[PDB]
């Protein structure tokens, strides 16, 4: 409640400041998606909502790697903006948590 | 199947098949499109010859990887990259690769038109008649969405304007506004 | 009547506009070969 909301509300704004200066950082590499994704509440994004959602065979200009659960990049599409891209080990862990 | 497979930052444009490459029919019409883009997107393009058979990913595995990672370096500065590949004639010819080409489908709409264009290139092209209409018939049987740009216009101004806006729009998706 | 009860009973019009349509394809795609091999 009170004791948890001090670290769990600045960790978003520390990651959003990680998100806001990432829009000028250069493109490291790009990947081809072989699956699709949609962001959920249980996906545990450090900034809830700002992550992207894609369909099959999409292209992700990976700007950078946010942490070991998320990357930072954007879907290559006009008007679309930078968000959070899940790492494949996190996409694997989002499959195991549904079964158990 | 992993989710993420490493492509370049800028996909290279692949000009495929009015017919088989290696002839006066195919290459000179493609030579129109390397002539157009050289000065239409001048200052924002890198147009290069691809000599190695990149469908093998014959050319050895060190030569192909060197040409693979060259294209990885060409698309590094967010620039459009074009390839003058001679071995490439098909989408499934490069399905297994991590390049993901913007496959541009030059189409002659009727096969009767094409065989008139073969007689006009001379009898040194008339020795290769049915072999040329074979692969253009393959691409006529190929699915349309497996390509990216399908060109069937006759005037150079028509197909290149259709070429120009589709390469400008992909420049906008690769370059978001500030 | 004769414009639609001779030729519409024949169908020569589709034959004539086809060859014109090929005539645009002949002139259209020859110019690219004409443009390409010199440049």
Curated annotation (Swiss-Prot), chain B:
It is found in: Cell membrane, Sarcolemma; Cell membrane. The N-terminus is blocked. Regulatory subunit of L-type calcium channels that consist of a pore-forming alpha subunit and auxiliary beta, gamma and delta subunits. Interacts with CACNA1A, CACNA1B, CACNA1C and CACNA1S. Component of a calcium channel complex consisting of a pore-forming alpha subunit (CACNA1S) and the ancillary subunits CACNB1 or CACNB2, CACNG1 and CACNA2D1. Identified in a complex with CACNA1C. Identified in a complex with the L-type calcium channel subunits CACNA1C, CACNA2D1, CACNB1 and one of the gamma subunits (CACNG4, CACNG6, CACNG7, or CACNG8). Regulatory subunit of L-type calcium channels. Regulates the activity of L-type calcium channels that contain CACNA1A as pore-forming subunit. Regulates the activity of L-type calcium channels that contain CACNA1C as pore-forming subunit and increases the presence of the channel complex at the cell membrane. Required for functional expression L-type calcium channels that contain CACNA1D as pore-forming subunit. Regulates the activity of L-type calcium channels that contain CACNA1B as pore-forming subunit. Belongs to the calcium channel beta subunit family. This is Voltage-dependent L-type calcium channel subunit beta-1. The chain holds residues 265 to 461 of 524 of the full protein.
Curated annotation (Swiss-Prot), chain C:
Phosphorylated. Phosphorylation by PKA activates the calcium channel. Both the minor and major forms are phosphorylated in vitro by PKA. Detected in skeletal muscle T-tubules (at protein level). Residues 20-37 are annotated as: Binding to the beta subunit. It is found in: Cell membrane, Sarcolemma, T-tubule. Each of the four internal repeats contains five hydrophobic transmembrane segments (S1, S2, S3, S5, S6) and one positively charged transmembrane segment (S4). S4 segments probably represent the voltage-sensor and are characterized by a series of positively charged amino acids at every third position. The loop between repeats II and III interacts with the ryanodine receptor, and is therefore important for calcium release from the endoplasmic reticulum necessary for muscle contraction. Belongs to the calcium channel alpha-1 subunit (TC 1.A.1.11) family. CACNA1S subfamily. Pore-forming, alpha-1S subunit of the voltage-gated calcium channel that gives rise to L-type calcium currents in skeletal muscle. Calcium channels containing the alpha-1S subunit play an important role in excitation-contraction coupling in skeletal muscle via their interaction with RYR1, which triggers Ca(2+) release from the sarcplasmic reticulum and ultimately results in muscle contraction. Long-lasting (L-type) calcium channels belong to the 'high-voltage activated' (HVA) group. Component of a calcium channel complex consisting of a pore-forming alpha subunit (CACNA1S) and the ancillary subunits CACNB1 or CACNB2, CACNG1 and CACNA2D1. The channel complex contains alpha, beta, gamma and delta subunits in a 1:1:1:1 ratio, i.e. it contains either CACNB1 or CACNB2. CACNA1S channel activity is modulated by the auxiliary subunits (CACNB1 or CACNB2, CACNG1 and CACNA2D1). Interacts with DYSF and JSRP1. Interacts with RYR1. Interacts with STAC, STAC2 and STAC3 (via their SH3 domains). Interaction with STAC3 promotes expression at the cell membrane. This is Voltage-dependent L-type calcium channel subunit alpha-1S. It comes from Oryctolagus cuniculus (Rabbit). The gene is CACNA1S. The chain holds residues 338 to 376 of 1873 of the full protein.
């Amino acid at each position: 409640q009170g004791p948890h909301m001090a670290l769990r509300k600045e960790a978003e704004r520390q990651a959003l400041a990680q998100l806001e200066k990432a829009k000028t950082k250069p493109v490291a590499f790009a990947v081809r998606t072989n699956v699709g994704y949609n962001p959920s509440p249980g996906d545990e994004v450090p900034v809830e909502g700002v992550a992207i959602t894609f369909e099959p065979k999409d292209f992700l200009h990976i700007k950078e790697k946010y942490n070991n659960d998320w990357w930072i990049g954007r879907l290559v599409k006009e008007g679309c903006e930078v968000g959070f891209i899940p790492s494949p080990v996190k996409l694997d862990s989002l499959r195991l948590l549904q079964e158990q | 199947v992993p989710p993420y497979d490493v492509v370049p930052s800028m996909r290279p444009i692949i000009l495929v098949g009015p017919s088989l490459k290696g002839y006066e029919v195919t290459d000179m019409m493609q030579k129109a499109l390397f002539d157009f883009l050289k000065h239409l997107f001048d200052g924002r393009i890198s147009i290069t010859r691809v000599t190695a058979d990149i469908s093998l990913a014959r050319s050895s595995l060190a030569e192909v990887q060197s040409e693979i990672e060259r294209i990885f370096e060409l698309a590094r500065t967010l620039q459009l990259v074009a390839l003058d590949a001679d071995t490439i004639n098909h989408p499934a010819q490069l399905s297994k690769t991590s390049l993901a080409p913007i496959i541009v489908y030059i189409k002659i709409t009727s096969p009767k038109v094409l065989q008139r264009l073969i007689k006009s290139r001379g009898k040194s092209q008339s020795k290769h008649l049915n072999v040329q209409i074979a692969a253009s018939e393959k691409l006529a049987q190929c699915p349309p969405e497996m390509f990216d740009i399908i060109l069937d216009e006759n005037q150079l101004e028509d197909a290149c304007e259709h070429l120009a806006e589709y390469l400008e729009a992909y420049w906008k998706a690769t370059h978001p506004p500030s | 009547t004769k414009e639609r009860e001779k030729a519409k009973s024949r169908g020569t019009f589709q034959k004539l506009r086809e060859k014109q349509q090929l005539e645009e394809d002949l002139r259209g795609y020859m110019s690219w070969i004409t443009q390409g091999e010199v440049m």
